[model samples]
Target chain A: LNDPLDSGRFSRKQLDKKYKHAGDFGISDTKKNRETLTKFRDAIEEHLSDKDTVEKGTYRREKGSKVYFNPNTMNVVIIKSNGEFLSGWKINPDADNGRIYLETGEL
Target chain B: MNKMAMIDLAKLFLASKITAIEFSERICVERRRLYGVKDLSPNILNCGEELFMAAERFEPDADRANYEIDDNGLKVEVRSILEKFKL
Candidate 1:
């Protein structure tokens, strides 16, 4: 999961404040519930890697803002013009055909 | 808390008629009323809630109604507990 784009930086403050929970990644397993902040950050960065052609794509882009989706992992993330990771999560595919929405949102 | 409202809220989200943020916010209210509710999965509610929160952060203006994706199951299992409340 190496990002060739090299634009996958997330803020530590946000990581500690909001993205600390494994639940933030749509992980429901009890074991993952205990995942530390490092693990959570790693998971998001891994998703940032553009390894799977079918898995990764841009949802929308405007004004240096971009939304990205990895339907394979059922994950969605946002990035700024500067490549700073904004927010991300593993959405439930079964929730409102979320996978389809994300996969198709690519331009 | 009206249990039926909870079910309807879940249904609304499952149907993709409402955005995840809307579903998440309304469910927060339900959670307040139905304290200590058990999750089908250890962290389904918490995860699903965060998923919606992130979605809001991703696209504050997104409306599921604009999409034509097929609406199906309530994968998060939020409905199961609410279903038990039926008399």
Candidate 2:
């Protein structure tokens, strides 16, 4: 088994490439990991929606009252009313897919 | 770039250096040059997509230079939730 990240063969752009010969193309995993990506994304989306997608009143560390994405990190960023950004990545975030980590997606 | 370097690609951006697109392209090129392979594994590829998506959800972190992130912080595991990695 080859670990793409370690082997240095994974990236969105090259994955979708087509080559005339075996060595001429780049192959990346797509549908193979779809199942988990959907599940995790759904969870995060629902939580934000449930909270009305706004973070309010606790005390903020960054900005306030917004939910968006930060291109630099490629993670869904949630700016709370109190000012902290939360992010979630859609991949083998961890060895086990049982947990989710929200990182500071601050600018 | 190796995995650590690729992982650091994000950190480099977080440190106020590269753009989301630059980071993604770096990964694309590195995977080929370093790994001598055409395709990236889902984990690696998905990781790139994760960053690429950031562009879609793009909101400039204009103050990045002022608010520098050393390593960000710990990654919290949502035991109740399992999610994004590949598409």
Candidate 3:
């Protein structure tokens, strides 16, 4: 079986061409693409480092400003203000179908 | 003319260095702010558009100066000749 983790062919040129028509295109002057990429990478790293609690099976949101479990685990998950479970899932902010959906497992 | 010279002339007109001259027309006007820059006419914008279109159509491999596009739009780097003024 293929090692399920074989690296894919990734090229900066290909990514640049693909996002040429994106709204972020032309926002960076002549030579600032590298700086923009660095900032995006830093933000993701910061978010992951702040994950403290982990839930078992699943996590659910509660009424007030906190998350409640299904009485099966003692994990404290973060929830959104709208009483929605803030699972570690995010939609591609730069692409269409812009909706709050799961990035892993079926939701 | 040399290929480089032809390309330079095309760029100069595009960059608004020289005014567009009509050979068949006999019109004369004095240089004034109301009339815009005497060296570079406003119509040069249209001329620049045409030159770009023609270059694309012809696909000439000439030595043209490089231009940069930024938040301020496209611009050509020009050298300053007022070195003596800097004391």
Candidate 4:
């Protein structure tokens, strides 16, 4: 799993604020929840890194959309506006899930 | 596979200066050349909203992370950054 402390991009407080907004949805705010999200994000990161790539932000645009990270690939794939998958090498895995869940958007 | 090309591609994606297709093409070509893949897969293009959700859903520590608030405590830079990444 990717260590949040080592990321250096976001602080502990910042992570909490993001997850607090997510509530208990996709990525909840708890040690277990954090572990799950971290593992998923790390997987995506590793996959991208294998190709010598790195990205800076991963997020959902709307609510109700399926948002997931593939640990095996370490690459973050987002369902695009046309419902097709668009992959990226960069991601921010410590934001709030509630505000970013697909349910909130038109998806 | 020029190092400068890779750096440029990374910058383009980070700055949101290039289309996802363009970014994906560069990445795919680079990967293919490096791994000798017969065919490269298409890049996953995400809407701003989807990207935001992914980040939120995958963040390891949603809570316990502090926020950098503006003077009125109305603006959170971190949230702003997340929102910017949203589709």
Candidate 5:
């Protein structure tokens, strides 16, 4: 099945947004497998397409937002209810909803 | 502006190239832009908020460049967040 979130229509701004944090995510090495806008896009697309990915709904703070966690890449993607891209970054295992999602299958 | 690497951000702060308020403001702004401010550690975020509020009150001072960030409290908080980024 295709990714629930539309992947082909994202903006360059959104792509660059995640690329900026590549260093924090441990994937910013220029020497090997450097993280570029294309790599970030591919990771997000692959994560959403992979069956092992799990998702949950957010409320209050980010009401009507959807949170997707890809276990394989440890990438977390957030999207608006209207399918607008919000943000994607590496999961903070100690802070974000990562522990719960990893232990269980959803946040 | 291109997003600064976390390590470089920390280095700038450590080198006094930016004050604690500026540093805090940068982190706050970046986190908000990234739509994950809630994910920022509570302690660091709280510290940033305090500095940010202070800036709101008395910025554009006689010497905005030398805003009193030398205080131990500010240093502790700023360094705490920097260390968290593993700088």
Candidate 6:
């Protein structure tokens, strides 16, 4: 759903921190991955512009982690470490923020 | 709590500003706040605490690829820590 929750209920300080973190690998040589992170960040920014309370960054599923997807490439990225990152997704559907599928074949 | 502080925490330990015990203690709180309801969200975890704990984890490294959130494990690290915090 394209919606942002109320303030204080969600942690803006935590989600915005996706920018400052360790990445999965050195992103200098990885242009596609870099681009993927760029787009995903952009999507979150755009969403936040209207919603203002939307949370961004990797999330936990009570078992494992989930990442934000690039609406264009259907790519999802996780923090690797210290300004590094990793992006992946098996398939894409219409390049929107919704209807994303992970390599595990789940939303 | 996104485990973002590991690198910074590692740095803090390297600076000798804190102790291994303190570092470990913080990691316990952080993991529980994160994935440890939780599941490693690291979002709501303590940045300062993680800095100490993560730094301790980084102190003994020839390679960082094999790192864990706690020297023991997230479960054990936080489990032991919970006793002190009394939640």
lDDT digits (tens) for residues A1-107 of candidate 2:
54332222123222222110112121232332434333333444454445333332221233454544322222333444543323432212331211222233223
Judged by TM-score relative to the true structure, which candidate is superior, 2 or 4? 2
Task: Give one digit per residue, the lDDT tens place, for model 1 in B22-71.
Answer: 66555544533433354334243444443333333332332522321212
Per-prediction interface RMSD? 9.1, 11.3, 22.7, 15.4, 10.0, 15.5
Model 5 lDDT tens row, B5-73: 333444576678987555544553454343344455544443333333232222233443243333344
Better of 1 and 6 by DockQ: 1
Q: How well does candidate 6 match the true structure in TM-score terms?
A: 0.22
Q: Model 1: how many Å of interface RMSD?
A: 9.1
Tens-place lDDT per residue, model 3, A1-107, is 43322113223332232221112212223232645433333332233334442332222222233432222212123344553323222212222111111222111
Instruction: Select the stronger candidate by TM-score from 1 and 3.
Output: 1
Interface RMSD of 2: 11.3
| lDDT of each residue in A37-69, candidate 4, tens digit only | 454444433443354432323333432234344
Residue-wise lDDT of candidate 3 within B1-87, one digit each (tens)? 121222344445345564222100001111111122234332332232223222222211243213212211211211111111110
Best-fitting candidate, scored by TM-score = 5
Alpha-carbon DockQ of candidate 5: 0.07
- The DockQ scores of all candidates, in the order shown, are 0.07, 0.04, 0.01, 0.02, 0.07, 0.03
lDDT of each: 0.48, 0.35, 0.26, 0.35, 0.50, 0.35
**Model 3 - which docking category?**
incorrect
| CAPRI band for model 5 | incorrect
Report the lDDT tens digits of candidate 6 across residue range A38-107. Answer: 5445444443334323213442321244444444333344333332332222122322122323333233
Give the better candidate number (3 or 6) by lDDT: 6
Better of 2 and 4 by DockQ: 2
lDDT of 4: 0.35
CAPRI classification of candidate 4: incorrect
